[PDB]
Amino acid sequence: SGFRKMAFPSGKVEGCMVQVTCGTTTLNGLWLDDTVYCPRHVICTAEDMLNPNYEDLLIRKSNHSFLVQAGNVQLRVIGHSMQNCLLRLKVDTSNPKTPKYKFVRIQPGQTFSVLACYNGSPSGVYQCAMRPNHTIKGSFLNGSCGSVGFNIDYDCVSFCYMHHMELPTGVHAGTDLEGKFYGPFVDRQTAQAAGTDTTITLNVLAWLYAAVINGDRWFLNRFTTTLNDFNLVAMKYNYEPLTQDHVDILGPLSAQTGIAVLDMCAALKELLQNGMNGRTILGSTILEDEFTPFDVVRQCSGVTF
Amino acid sequence: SGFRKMAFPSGKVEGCMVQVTCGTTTLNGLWLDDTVYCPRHVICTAEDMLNPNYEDLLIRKSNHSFLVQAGNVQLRVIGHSMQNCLLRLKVDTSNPKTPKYKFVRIQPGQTFSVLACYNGSPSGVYQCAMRPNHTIKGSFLNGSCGSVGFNIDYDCVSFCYMHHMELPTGVHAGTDLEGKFYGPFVDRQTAQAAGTDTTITLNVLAWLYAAVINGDRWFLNRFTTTLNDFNLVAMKYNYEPLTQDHVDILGPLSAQTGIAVLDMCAALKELLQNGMNGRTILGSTILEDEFTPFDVVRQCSGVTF
Numbered sequence: 001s002g003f004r005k006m007a008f009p010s011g012k013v014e015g016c017m018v019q020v021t022c023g024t025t026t027l028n029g030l031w032l033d034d035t036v037y038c039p040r041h042v043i044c045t046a047e048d049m050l051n052p053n054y055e056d057l058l059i060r061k062s063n064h065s066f067l068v069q070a071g072n073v074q075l076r077v078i079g080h081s082m083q084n085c086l087l088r089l090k091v092d093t094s095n096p097k098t099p100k101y102k103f104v105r106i107q108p109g110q111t112f113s114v115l116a117c118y119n120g121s122p123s124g125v126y127q128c129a130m131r132p133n134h135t136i137k138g139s140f141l142n143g144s145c146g147s148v149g150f151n152i153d154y155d156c157v158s159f160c161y162m163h164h165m166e167l168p169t170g171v172h173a174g175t176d177l178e179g180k181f182y183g184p185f186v187d188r189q190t191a192q193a194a195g196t197d198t199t200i201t202l203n204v205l206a207w208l209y210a211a212v213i214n215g216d217r218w219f220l221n222r223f224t225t226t227l228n229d230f231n232l233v234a235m236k237y238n239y240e241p242l243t244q245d246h247v248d249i250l251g252p253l254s255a256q257t258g259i260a261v262l263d264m265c266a267a268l269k270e271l272l273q274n275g276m277n278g279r280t281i282l283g284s285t286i287l288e289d290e291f292t293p294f295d296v297v298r299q300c301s302g303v304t305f
Numbered sequence: 306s307g308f309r310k311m312a313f314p315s316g317k318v319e320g321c322m323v324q325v326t327c328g329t330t331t332l333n334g335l336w337l338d339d340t341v342y343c344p345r346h347v348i349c350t351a352e353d354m355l356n357p358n359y360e361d362l363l364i365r366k367s368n369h370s371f372l373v374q375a376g377n378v379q380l381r382v383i384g385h386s387m388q389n390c391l392l393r394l395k396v397d398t399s400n401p402k403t404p405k406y407k408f409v410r411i412q413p414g415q416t417f418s419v420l421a422c423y424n425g426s427p428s429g430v431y432q433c434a435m436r437p438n439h440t441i442k443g444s445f446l447n448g449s450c451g452s453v454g455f456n457i458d459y460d461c462v463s464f465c466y467m468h469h470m471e472l473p474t475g476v477h478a479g480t481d482l483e484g485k486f487y488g489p490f491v492d493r494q495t496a497q498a499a500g501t502d503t504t505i506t507l508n509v510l511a512w513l514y515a516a517v518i519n520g521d522r523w524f525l526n527r528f529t530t531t532l533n534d535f536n537l538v539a540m541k542y543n544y545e546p547l548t549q550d551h552v553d554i555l556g557p558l559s560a561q562t563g564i565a566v567l568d569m570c571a572a573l574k575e576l577l578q579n580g581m582n583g584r585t586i587l588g589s590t591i592l593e594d595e596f597t598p599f600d601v602v603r604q605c606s607g608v609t610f
């Protein structure tokens with residue numbers, strides 16, 4: 001029993017983190033096979049951060065402009081290229097600890113684990129959700145750029161995020177491992193702001209199912225609702241509209257608990273209109289939206305209590 | 306910026322997890338050098354769980370009664386002994402992935418990372434605090450016994466917890482790596498209950514300092530308080546009494562923020578008496594007590610905003 005925000009074990013990723021230095025700028029890189037991936041802004045200086053021309057900045061560099069360190073070992077770069085907002089540095093040694101892996105672009109609402117790193121050295125691991133506004137609410141300080149996000153399936157690491165920047169609201173933005181940003185953001189220090197965010201409805205419902213699987217039913221009720229009537233209430237409380245696809249995704253959790261999706265929607269509508277009345281759900285006094293249906297199935301018992 | 310419950314990177318510990326089977330009972334073990342540690346109740350059968358005599362149960366076993374698997378590799382046990390509530394199984398192979406490590410008994414209020422494991426295979430990592438009542442609020446299912454808790458300093462893993470049992474309130478109990486239980490609990494299925502718990506005052510204050518370091522001062526006030534007057538309020542709200550030792554521990558955070566400890570105590574007293582008025586601190590609508598002063602210094606910027 002119990003329910004916690006849980007990260008994936010980070011071992012397979014720790015063995016891929018390295019340090020990349022260019023001039024006076026140091027940040028993290030990801031070392032897979034004979035390639036090191038890192039944010040392209042490693043080549044920037046303080047003066048040119050407002051409006052850098054990366055093509056022009058990169059053509060001026062050589063292979064020896066980049067210092068790559070794995071632990072105490074120097075890796076000589078033998079080639080380099082730019083891919084969107086990343087640099088790909090070819091190195092002379094293939095990482096012996098390269099796990100089975102792939103690169104995935106995750107969708108808003110989905111979750112992943114972040115390995116926060118400084119100077120190529122891992123400091124911590126935590127779970128994050130990609131917000132509807134394409135930011136994440138992380139914990140990142142100076143030097144954290146190049147830290148990666150990932151999920152694990154069997155022995156395959158799906159990398160989905162590399163960290164680049166912090167916005168004025170304290171939230172974080174970055175790219176997939178092909179260097180394409182999540183959201184409309186750009187890697188320059190021109191004024192940018194996160195769009196307005198929304199609560200991830202599908203995840204709140206998943207988490208309500210988790211609470212029932214763990215033995216708690218207090219928030220259920222005898223009512224039901226239509227999709228449309230639910231969505232009127234969702235719009236009022238800044239929740240994402242629920243779609244039939246979302247209803248279908250909740251099928252397995254619905255089957256395991258015997259609670260119809262639209263009945264759980266009625267329960268959520270009631271929680272939104274009346275509040276929680278000083279009660280808790282899975283230890284929380286608020287409605288949690290950073291657990292996906294898949295997170296719930298992974299962590300919870302296959303048998304309800 | 307940002308603040309999150311953060312676990313230690315789990316790599317050094319993942320390489321130590323194995324599977325231990327005795328009869329029809331399988332659980333996890335910890336493989337360091339040529340020893341495998343696991344809960345002694347691996348030798349129990351369903352019928353004898355209520356009142357087992359472990360000395361009598363163990364003398365009836367041989368080395369070949371225990372099957373130890375590391376990944377797909379069988380490790381032959383060549384010796385065994387009982388140490389308090391653990392078994393120590395000597396094996397024929399020394400773990401090549403043994404990290405620098407030590408065994409520590411942590412104190413109530415302190416935090417650690419748990420690597421949840423099933424069948425000797427890690428499934429997730431999360432941060433936990435040892436509660437004042439010597440339990441933890443974890444996420445553990447059937448098969449999780451033998452999963453370990455730890456902290457990391459430099460390259461040294463300090464193991465502090467091994468999981469044994471779940472109590473009726475859904476909370477969890479276990480031992481240090483010498484097999485001595487945290488709290489008054491015993492490894493038998495006789496009626497036992499967690500003592501009443503208390504909020505970890507020192508941690509709440511640490512987390513308030515973190516909120517100030519991250520740029521938020523709304524909950525501060527012009528008042529101060531004595532230790533004694535604070536402790537009258539603490540007793541009313543089921544908070545641990547604050548001691549001079551706790552005040553001294555908060556010295557560095559106090560110095561970095563310029564806020565006197567007893568002034569922060571006045572701020573906390575006000576939060577307890579008036580509530581939060583629909584406002585948040587570091588993303589939370591409630592007072593968080595699972596971050597130690599040391600957790601805060603580790604994660605936060607060395608410079609206030």
Ligand SMILES: *[C@](O)(C(=O)NC(C)C)[C@H](C[C@@H]1CCNC1=O)NC(=O)[C@H](CC(C)C)NC(=O)[C@H](Cc1ccc(F)cc1)NC(=O)OCc1ccccc1
Pocket residue numbers: 025026027041044049140141142143144145164165166167168172186187188189190191192193306
């Ligand atoms: C990584 O590049 C990094 O770790 N670099 C090391 C070599 C020091 C950082 C990670 C940041 C630092 C703090 N938390 C983080 O996640 N990333 C960057 O420094 C970005 C550089 C690229 C050219 C994108 N820039 C930013 O993250 C800035 C932060 C900032 C905030 C206040 C301030 F006064 C100066 C800088 N954010 C940003 O520029 O967003 C757009 C914006 C600009 C101006 C006004 C509003 C929004």
Ligand SMILES: *[C@](O)(C(=O)NC(C)C)[C@H](C[C@@H]1CCNC1=O)NC(=O)[C@H](CC(C)C)NC(=O)[C@H](Cc1ccc(F)cc1)NC(=O)OCc1ccccc1
Pocket residue numbers: 001330331332346349354445446447448449450469470471472473477491492493494495496497498
């Ligand atoms: C591990 O031994 C384990 O993973 N074993 C695998 C071989 C299946 C489990 C981990 C538990 C399972 C669920 N969540 C967990 O953390 N530990 C145990 O099974 C304990 C065995 C030892 C002899 C201590 N026993 C317990 O954890 C029980 C759970 C329980 C709850 C309800 C119920 F009806 C039966 C069992 N808890 C317990 O016995 O505490 C004392 C108590 C007994 C009776 C009444 C009140 C309290």
